[PDB]
Design a protein around this ligand. Structure first.
Ligand SMILES: CN(C)c1ncnc2c1ncn2[C@@H]1O[C@H](CO)[C@@H](NC(=O)[C@@H](N)CCC(=O)O)[C@H]1O
Ligand SMILES: CN(C)c1ncnc2c1ncn2[C@@H]1O[C@H](CO)[C@@H](NC(=O)[C@@H](N)CCC(=O)O)[C@H]1O
Lengths: 399, 399
């Protein structure tokens, strides 16, 4: 544990511009860092909301590591560093608490390191456990349940108002960005068709392409309504585009009764007052979506302590993992140190008090190795390494 | 070095009552301290102007050691602790800079420890060097030359005014304490006889006894003067006791001309104005003595840097001494640790792959001992001991 440090700056303590600066431009930054600091390993985790460097073997240069991130970068050591990673992977350090994306981003960080050669066994253990933990926390708790963005909220609302969306048609009117976000969420959920209309046909062709939908004429809005079940209206011009008369006409046009959900994303409003009172029509706003997202976010936050309990349990596990690792690495070294004295010394008894018992010293050597590894175990790691260094320096020279 | 601490309070930072409190009452305090703190050794140096405890092996309990001295006791470690000792023995921490007494007091501290069993090899090395240094500093520099008290100043003045004192007679008139101090210094220097007079005969008998002199009658003052060469006058009553007429009569009485020095210690003055103008008579005061002492003290202070240079040289020497000590103690332990594995393991090869080469392993063991001692050498002492402990724990158990 103690041989790991974490350095970084995040949205928890810095603004969107202090984060940008700190961001590393080069896809190979994790590799450069390893060389420029003689690290055993490193993983670089960077998103719009954090820049964090995990390093193995940094360790008298932790504050320095902090420096090529930012003058207010924090520095975490050992258990705290791993705990922060576990909190990041589990979604606890994200604005959208529990979000799936940050887990994907931790995995990408791990892969980029794997492929650039900046992983060591220790970071493999930590990251592997971090990744499996993020998955478990999201399965065993409710930390990632419930819509916490406008897009996902629109899907919850549509599902509640209309049922299964798979066979529904979405009409998108206008090009406002929040409208594009809502439409993409509906599309990702699964709908049958998307119709796109805009007062400038070319804006429509563009968005339909994005969405995988069909650009339609703005002047045929009545027929569009007649065939649609969810309407996403986000026009830029300040005039309403969905009128009572058009909606009534669209509904009389269709032989089959079914509910229509109209989501008014524009301000001023795209939907004429009174549309909401037409029978089979439901009207909701961008504000209604923000309310849904907020209620769900507030609920996800109440799962944080259950996730934190999972984390402390997992910390104890990885701690023992890392110890077994060091035990394994401690014996192999010591043994190479003691076998080299054994070999050197083997020749010499050969030249005798003249004028295979191979043997006693392979046994005595095994005994010595076990004795020494424990002793280096046995009082710590701040050291362990140098004493492991000392035994090893002394063996090559004095041996 | 690093295994030594010094704790204490001195006149440099505390007043005469903060020192008293801290003082240890029991002649056996140094021994009690050793037990109550599990020390390898300790020397207690205590005088009216300092209470200092030197401890070997205290070392995670240094601040604690500070506590049974005083809440403002300082704590010195390693080199600084030894440097302070060297400064104390050399007279540099004393009000009377360079004074002989503090060196005697350091030696007594060393002897008391020797005799109570609280010395270890390390404190022997340090104290021995401290003692030999105090002697050298006082021989090779002028740090302890020149009178720096009223008593010693009176001897300088008497010697300058009169020459050799060995054949001179001292007359002491009165019992004022500063008069007693002056007389004792003259006596310690070497005079032929001391006459003691007081308006109360019994006060005289008392002081003469102290001084090893003769009590004489106060009313025979003229004859006393006639036979004396130095007069120390320190009467308590406010009347002058040495009068012009008596001095002239005393001088006409004596066949042989020789100078008389009269030291007036009293205030108001014991000596009548005008006595100083009698031919062959010299009169000086307690004030004149303070002037002499001060000039000499100011001169001794200018030798401080030469003494400090001696000290830094000596620190480097003892530092190497203490290192050789630890090397010696480090090999003997390690060897006992490795020979016990050697012995344990020796039996067992005996039981063979059946169904003296004593020998190869005495050689291999010697090799191992040299290798290991260096490694424990090799990265430090904050540790060295525990690693020396670790090797040793691991050997008894795993061996
Ligand atoms: C080209 N570029 C900078 C870019 N391209 C595509 N998507 C991007 C992006 N930057 C950011 N994003 C996305 O926009 C969100 C807000 O900035 C991003 N959010 C995250 O990466 C979160 N997953 C971070 C969580 C954390 O706690 O660190 C992303 O969805
Ligand atoms: C009984 N008793 C307390 C006592 N008896 C005899 N002499 C004593 C004494 N206490 C002190 N002395 C002497 O008086 C001086 C002033 O207090 C003492 N000075 C010292 O011990 C110096 N040598 C200290 C130097 C230092 O730097 O610590 C002593 O001469």
């Amino acid at each position: 544990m103690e041989d790991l440090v974490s350095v970084g700056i995040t949205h928890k303590e810095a603004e969107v511009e202090e984060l940008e600066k700190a961001r590393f431009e080069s896809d190979e930054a994790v590799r450069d860092i390893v060389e420029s600091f003689g690290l055993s390993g490193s993983v670089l985790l960077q998103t719009s909301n954090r820049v964090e460097v995990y390093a193995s073997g940094a360790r008298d240069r932790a504050e320095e590591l902090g420096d090529l991130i930012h003058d207010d970068a924090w520095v975490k050591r050992g258990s705290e560093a791993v705990r922060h990673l576990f909190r990041v992977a589990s979604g606890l350090e994200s604005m959208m608490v529990g979000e799936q994306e940050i887990l994907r981003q931790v995995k990408k960080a791990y892969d980029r390191a794997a492929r650039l050669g900046t992983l060591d066994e220790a970071l493999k253990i930590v990251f592997r456990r971090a990744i499996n933990l993020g998955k478990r926390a999201r399965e065993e708790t409710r930390i990632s349940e419930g819509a916490v963005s406008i897009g996902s909220a629109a899907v919850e609302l549509a599902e509640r108002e209309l049922g299964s969306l798979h066979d529904k048609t979405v009409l998108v009117v206008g090009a406002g960005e929040m409208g594009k976000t809502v439409a993409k969420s509906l599309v990702d959920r699964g709908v049958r068709a998307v119709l796109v209309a805009n007062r400038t046909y070319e804006r429509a062709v563009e968005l339909a392409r994005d969405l995988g939908g069909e650009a339609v004429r703005f002047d045929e809005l009545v027929d569009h309504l007649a065939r649609s079940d969810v309407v996403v209206s986000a026009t830029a011009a300040p005039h309403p585009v969905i009128h009572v008369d058009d909606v009534r006409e669209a509904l009389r046009k269709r032989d089959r009764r079914s509910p229509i959900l109209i989501i008014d994303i524009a301000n001023p409003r795209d939907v004429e007052e009174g549309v909401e009172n037409i029978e089979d029509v439901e009207v909701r706003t961008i504000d209604d979506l923000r309310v849904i997202a907020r209620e769900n976010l507030e609920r996800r936050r109440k799962e944080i302590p259950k996730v934190e309990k999972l984390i402390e349990e997992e910390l104890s596990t990885v701690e023992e993992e890392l110890e077994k690792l060091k035990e394994r690495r401690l014996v192999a070294d010591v043994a190479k140190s003691l076998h080299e004295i054994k070999d050197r010394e083997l020749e010499r008894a050969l030249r005798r008090l003249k004028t295979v018992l191979q043997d006693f010293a392979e046994a005595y050597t095994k005994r010595l190795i076990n004795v020494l590894t424990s002793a280096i175990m046995e009082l710590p790691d701040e050291y362990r390494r140098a004493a492991s260094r000392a035994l090893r320096r002394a063996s090559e020279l004095n041996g």
